[PDB]
Amino acid sequence: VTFKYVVKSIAYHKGYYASFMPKPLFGVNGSGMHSNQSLFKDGKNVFYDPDTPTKLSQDAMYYIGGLLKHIREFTAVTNPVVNSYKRLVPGYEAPVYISWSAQNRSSLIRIPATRGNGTRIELRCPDPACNPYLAFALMLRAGLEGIKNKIDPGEPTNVNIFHLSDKEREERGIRSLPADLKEAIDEMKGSKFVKEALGEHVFSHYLCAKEMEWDEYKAVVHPWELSRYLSML
Amino acid sequence: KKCTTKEDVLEAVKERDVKFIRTQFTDTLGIIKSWAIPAEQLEEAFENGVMFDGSSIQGFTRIEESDMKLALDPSTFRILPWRPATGAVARILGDVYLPDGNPFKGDPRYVLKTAIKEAEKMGFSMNVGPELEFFLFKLDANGNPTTELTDQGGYFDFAPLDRAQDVRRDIDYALEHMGFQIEASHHEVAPSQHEIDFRFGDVLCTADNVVTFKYVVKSIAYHKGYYASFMPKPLFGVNGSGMHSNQSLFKDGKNVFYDPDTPTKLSQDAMYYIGGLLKHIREFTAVTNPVVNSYKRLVPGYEAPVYISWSAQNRSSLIRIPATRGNGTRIELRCPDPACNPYLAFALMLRAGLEGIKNKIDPGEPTNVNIFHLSDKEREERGIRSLPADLKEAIDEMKGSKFVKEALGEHVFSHYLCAKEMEWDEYKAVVHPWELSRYLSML
Amino acid sequence: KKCTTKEDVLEAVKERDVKFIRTQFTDTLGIIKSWAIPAEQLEEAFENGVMFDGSSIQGFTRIEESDMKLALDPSTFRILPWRPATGAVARILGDVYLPDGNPFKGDPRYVLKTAIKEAEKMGFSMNVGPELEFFLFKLDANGNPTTELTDQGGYFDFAPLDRAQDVRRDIDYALEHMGFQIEASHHEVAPSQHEIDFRFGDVLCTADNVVTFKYVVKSIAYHKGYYASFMPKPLFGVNGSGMHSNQSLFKDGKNVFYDPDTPTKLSQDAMYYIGGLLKHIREFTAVTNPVVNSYKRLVPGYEAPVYISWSAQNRSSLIRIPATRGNGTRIELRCPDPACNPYLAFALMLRAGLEGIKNKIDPGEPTNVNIFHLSDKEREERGIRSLPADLKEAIDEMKGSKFVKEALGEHVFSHYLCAKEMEWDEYKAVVHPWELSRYLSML
Ligand SMILES: [Mg+2]
Ligand SMILES: [Mg+2]
């Protein structure tokens, strides 16, 4: 939170402007906020396991399993503005499919090759417009639920998902993130886990604010429509 | 002084109050890549190295992120020649290692190191002194680069004399302040074109200096209001910018090329070395001339060579032997341009020359006449080959070259071709304004 | 009506009050050449012919004046479709003769006539109906041609509907007034692109009509405030303009391609005719695509074919056989563009086709799949060749083809190559603005 307004203030006094929009320009990569995370018990990392072929503990598998199960529900928190879903489109570094991998980078959850005390898990969905307090809290709560319930994360996806076909994705059972803000709200609105974690007061207030914001956006006539339709029709 | 140990590097940072350390490395295509490190992190970085996204090395054709570790080299530490009010700034180089500990074979620096090691097997070491040429244009009101000239001077002219003169002097002083030990600097044939010459040194050290030289000059021009460009041919009708490479092989501390007993004062090895270069120069021309614009410079009518020949007095030859003898004996190759990757270019030059020495390749009779003034029948009669006309032709030659793939390694070979192939395909489908001015009214 | 004799031509001139007569002929490179003659001189011209500078036929590579005599052909008389206040205007064609009386072999029209005689020796005659495509741009304030679109319509769209609609209708009416017998006219895929289909008629008459068609349309557009362009690719990212050619061979008044007893309703001769075209198409590609801009259109991803194949249902194939059968059986070649010379293009197409029939060349299996979707290994496995990538490559192919030299004659062959060679050399040394946008800042 401090970093955001410190950078913005410096740019003004030097004559420039720093922006945190998830996608300010079309045709170029967007701005994201990946979140490396690790869990420590008794002063030691719990993800690292020297006795496993992947050097990852059983808890780390469950932690990833919990994240994958619930990531669809609280996607609105990690991507809170309408512009956030212009970044989540196929063809860039942004992930739009729910998968985890070790060597692939297009996966939603990436495990860096670093091991030992530096073992970490990277989630690539959030963008800087998100609220760090809410995003991290849900990210922690989702992982713990997976550990508590021993959710199996399934097989990793080492292939390029974007190159696969829809039948292949259907055969492999690969889900996708919500396409737009309205779809995300519908998912997050029936999720009892999100409501329990965020509390009743924050849950209701967050939904109403986003709901009003989407309704205003859905009724605007963008200049792109005029260029394509004014002369044709 | 010269810093050799990490303790010396740390002492210098504390002494001169360096706040930021910038790594330095180049991708496959020759672009300079770097990132910043706070001064406090330096001590830990020396002990364990830095983890970074190494997919940037593979160019702009990267698909998947891959992690590998960079280990800093204290012997390459140096301080950039500008003093911000905050504090001093310094740069450093290093080696790239995969997580399993094996060195990454896709690093252009590693390619040159293997070539040096190959020469060491035969007991040779090479010294390179390159001649870099660049332009100095004006900036628009928005600070974007333009092609506005700064003076209409000529060859070796005492130009410029306006405030741009101070800008040129600042570049020379800054390079000297870094310890490059420049030999000479002068105006070039084209307007607003300048040339800077380097002293001989170890090829690895020279290659690093060339990379550092490029962004040092560019940074100075911006802060003075000008722009320095390294395009092989930014303007039509004037000479282009090239990077000639004077080179020599040293064995047992003495020059191999020099031979007092021969009439030309050149050793038998030098003849073989030239023969090896002539045989293979056509194959790796794409490396020395990587961009499309490089072949707008390789056209007849200027100092740029377009025919494969060597001479002692003629200048139009691709390979020229300067009249200097003794320890100064050298061989100058005039094909490369500043847009080339110095690591890849020098490595291929060394490997190609060594192969000629091993195989006793005869360079043939030198051409002491003007090849351009000759006719096609004469060139066919004399068997004078020509360099590839366009980037696509160069790629086709390079692609089937077994020797090039062996020298550069499989990973670099495949990645380099794909990046160039995509670049050419984009260019070939454009409708340039020259066509409109010629065909719109006619047809 | 139809004018046959010089007496009929003179009677028509007096009756309709034609004040000026314009000769019409084309040079080697396809430019339209003409000069004016007063109506009174017409009677003398028919008696003895007109002396004129014959060095204009050799293109812009002319060096020395040379005199040849043009003998007017009364059967080609026609009246231009505009009515100046002073009086009517008419055009006429004729043959070129050397002073000693021998016909001039450098005339593109004479090249086609020789090809017809060669076909007539086998008893065949050809009918050709081409499909010409062109753009319609706006003029600037100074009347110079530009490239602003007049509408954003699509394929077969009912566009334009503004005042440009009347201009489009005027072109159709003027051509009909000439007696062109237009088949159909419609909008094309690219914005402001239109296509006109000619009536399926005799090859010699068609070639003259195509030449007449070009300047008739251009003149109309100017007087209405617009500009008509025939560039093979005036805009990037949209379809180019091509001139597909449908041809058929007739013997004894019957089509020879149609065979009711075959599964494909195609005769054995038609298979050989296609086989001859496929074998030699690479050699004379420069004739069908004579300008540099032509090869910007020949890129994958559009309607233009870039692979040598023939098919019955596919469209990307170079040679397409329409589903029509019987007397209307025809073969469509999709490589040519409107910038080509109709006389040279048709003559080579005839000579190549006959050579296949004479030698019984097998056309091979048709390609019914999308070639662009296949891989390079598949194309290599299937043995699918590709058209020349750029004008320089086409010249190299066409410069060694002995068949092209034999068909076009020594004089036309040498002159055509030199003119194209000089044009390419000028283009290859230009620094296009696209290079500056990509390389000025990066390097
Ligand atoms: Mg020089
Ligand atoms: Mg069409």
Numbering used by the authors:
A (entry chain B): 215 to 447
B (entry chain A), C (entry chain V): 5 to 447
Original authors' sentences:
The enzyme, glutamine synthetase (GS; EC 6.3.1.2, L-glutamate: ammonia ligase) plays a central role in cellular nitrogen assimilation by incorporating ammonium into glutamine, which serves as a carbon and nitrogen donor for the biosynthesis of nucleotides, amino acids and lipids. Here we describe a structural dissection of the archaeal Methanosarcina mazei (Mm) GS and its regulation. Like the Gram-positive GS, the Mm GS active sites are formed at the interface between two subunits in the hexamer and are comprised of five regions; the E flap (Mm residues 303–310), the Y loop (residues 369–377), the N loop (residues 235–247), the Y179 loop (residues 152–161) and the D50 ´ loop (residues 56-71), which is the only active site region contributed from the adjacent subunit. Like other GS dodecamers, the Mm GS dodecamer is formed by two interfaces; hexamer and inter-hexamer interfaces.
To next gain structural insight into Mm GS we utilized cryo-electron microscopy (Cryo-EM). These experiments, performed with apo Mm GS at ~20 μM, revealed that 14% of the sample was captured in a partially oligomerized form with the remaining particles adopting a dodecameric state; particles corresponding to monomers/dimers were not processed due to their small sizes. The fully oligomerized Mm GS structure, which was resolved to 3.0 Å resolution, is composed of a dodecamer with stacked hexamer rings. Similar to these GS structures, each Mm GS subunit is composed of 15 β-strands and 15 α-helices and each subunit is divided into a larger C-domain and an N-domain by helix α3. As expected, structural homology searches showed that Mm GS subunits display the strongest similarity to subunits of Gram-positive bacterial GS structures, with root mean squared deviations (rmsds) of 0.5–1.0 Å for 430 similar Cα atoms compared to the Bs GS, Lm GS, Sa GS and Pp GS18. The inter-hexamer/thong contacts in the Mm GS and the bacterial GS structures are essentially identical. By contrast, the hexamer interfaces differ in structure and sequence in a region corresponding to Mm GS residues 165–169. In Mm GS residues 165-168 form an extra turn of helix and residues 167-168, which are an arginine and alanine, are positioned outside the oligomer interface; unlike the leucine, the arginine in Mm GS cannot bind within the hydrophobic pocket. Interestingly, Mm residues 165–169 are proximal to the catalytic Y179 loop, suggesting this region could impact GS active site formation. For these experiments we compared samples of apo Mm GS and apo Bs GS at concentrations of 75 nM. These experiments showed that 97% of the apo Mm GS was present as dimers with no dodecamers present.
